């Protein structure tokens, strides 16, 4: 019983080739280089999901910090005032407010500024 | 069960076959379980049985047993044991009766020996070439008897 390989190697090879579509030259043509690039690309994608979670936080912090310095308050004290006033809002939504709703963002800063903590 | 649906009892037919050459996903790829570059990982094998890497093996270290009856064979005996003979159903135990009960082969001439201590209830009449003194005591403590063929 001589089992002969055909359509088994080609199908699993073409899957890797399909994944590595849009690469530079031989990186999409040859199966070997395509397989290496897909594995490396998967590693990159894994690492950059974690790094995206951190980098977008940093960007929101930067935007919020800037929005506060125009009014004379700093980020380091704004978050402290937020905690003492029990207000719980993401820096993402706060930055979205300062870019989309200047009046309501200014309302939040006014309350945290001076109103009695709790 | 039909021939289009036939099934074995669970955990009787199929067991995990360890395939040693088909990929790392099975945990038995590349090296195939031999280890790494040593004598046991080559095609030769696992040396010799009893080898100790040059140190004198255990058998070569210990003295040889002695055979007093050199070139001889121990005389085999057919032994009737008292603890189990009660379970067998027969009276007047001779060679012919054992042949009918097929305990002994008709094409055998081995001498019959009686052995045992366990008490028996019904009396039996043995025809034995040899019998122990206390086995005879047990047999004759009941209403049985024993004759010693010569």
């Amino acid at each position: 019983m001589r089992i002969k390989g055909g359509k088994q190697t080609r199908v699993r090879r073409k899957k890797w080739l399909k994944q590595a579509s849009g690469s530079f030259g031989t990186r999409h043509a040859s199966y070997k280089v395509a397989k290496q690039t897909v594995i490396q690309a998967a590693k990159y994608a894994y690492r950059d999901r974690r790094n995206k979670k951190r980098d977008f936080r940093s960007l929101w912090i930067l935007r919020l910090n800037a929005a506060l310095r125009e009014q004379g308050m700093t980020y380091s004290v704004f978050i402290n005032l937020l905690k003492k006033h029990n207000i719980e809002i993401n820096r993402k939504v706060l930055s979205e407010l300062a870019i989309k709703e200047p009046s309501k963002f200014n309302l939040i800063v006014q309350k945290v500024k001076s109103e009695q903590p709790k | 069960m039909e021939l289009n649906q036939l099934k074995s009892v669970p955990k009787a037919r199929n067991h995990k076959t360890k395939t040693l050459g088909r990929g790392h996903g099975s945990g038995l790829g590349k090296t195939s379980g031999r280890g790494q570059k040593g004598q046991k990982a080559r095609k030769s094998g696992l040396t010799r049985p009893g080898f100790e890497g040059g140190q004198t093996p255990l058998y070569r270290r210990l003295p040889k047993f002695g055979n007093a009856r050199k070139g001889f064979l121990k005389q085999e005996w057919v032994v009737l044991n008292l603890n189990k003979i009660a379970k067998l159903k027969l009276d007047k135990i001779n060679r012919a009766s054992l042949i009918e009960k097929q305990v002994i082969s008709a094409k055998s001439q081995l001498p019959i020996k009686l052995i045992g201590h366990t008490k028996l209830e019904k009396p039996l009449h043995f025809e034995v070439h040899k019998v122990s003194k206390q086995a005879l005591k047990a047999v004759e403590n009941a209403n049985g008897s024993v004759k010693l063929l010569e």
Partner: protein, 211 residues
């Protein structure tokens, strides 16, 4: 059970035959049945596959190139397994056994349960010598008999004790149906039947064989 006779015309006899309880078993064994079918499927293998190993294939036992100083890799023969000439490393051999052993009592138990489940069921009618010779040796009459009995698509098996010739002359051009002696039927032939016609003296021989 109620095992009833069948006549040549396809009508049923009005007198059913009682069955001794020794034939039917309250306890059924399926693993011995499975092993019996497997050993029947085995031993049907011719096993005439053969291949030429590295030494058996005609070729040059010399080294093609020198061991060193050539840009090519080390080679020892032109008929190595990884060569196109072809030396098969292990390959099938014509010395394989393919045979399996099953105990005599295990086979008896498998046959016992298979008879129990096949018997006392539909299409398990009783047959005699009259229609075994009323066939006249013409397979047209037997086709009519199967049509009347509505057993055309069934793989009916005739179980025969006296090897009637008229019945064997027919049912030989029929790839579907077949006839066997009691000492010739096995577990696999019994449960492939889907329908069977058993002779009364065959049935009497069955209780005797089971013991």
């Amino acid at each position: 059970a109620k095992l009833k006779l069948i006549k040549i015309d396809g009508s049923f006899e009005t007198e059913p035959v009682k069955l001794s309880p020794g034939l039917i078993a309250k306890e059924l064994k399926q693993q011995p049945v499975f092993d019996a079918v497997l050993v029947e499927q085995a031993s049907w293998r011719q096993g005439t596959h053969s291949i030429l190993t590295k030494g058996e294939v005609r070729g040059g036992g010399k080294k093609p190139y020198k061991q060193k100083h050539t840009g090519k890799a080390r080679q020892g023969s032109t008929r190595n397994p990884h060569f196109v000439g072809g030396g098969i490393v292990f390959g099938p051999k014509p010395n394989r056994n393919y045979s399996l052993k099953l105990n005599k009592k295990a086979h008896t138990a498998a046959l016992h349960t298979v008879w129990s489940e096949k018997l006392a069921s539909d299409n398990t009618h009783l047959v005699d010598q009259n229609l075994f010779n009323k066939t006249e040796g013409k397979t047209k009459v037997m086709m009519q008999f199967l049509k009347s009995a509505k057993l055309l698509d069934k793989n009916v098996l005739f179980v025969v004790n006296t090897l009637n010739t008229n019945l064997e002359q027919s049912t030989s051009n029929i790839k579907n149906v077949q006839v066997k002696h009691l000492d010739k039927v096995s577990v696999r032939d019994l449960m492939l039947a889907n329908a069977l016609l058993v002779e009364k003296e065959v049935l009497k021989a069955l209780e005797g064989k089971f013991k």
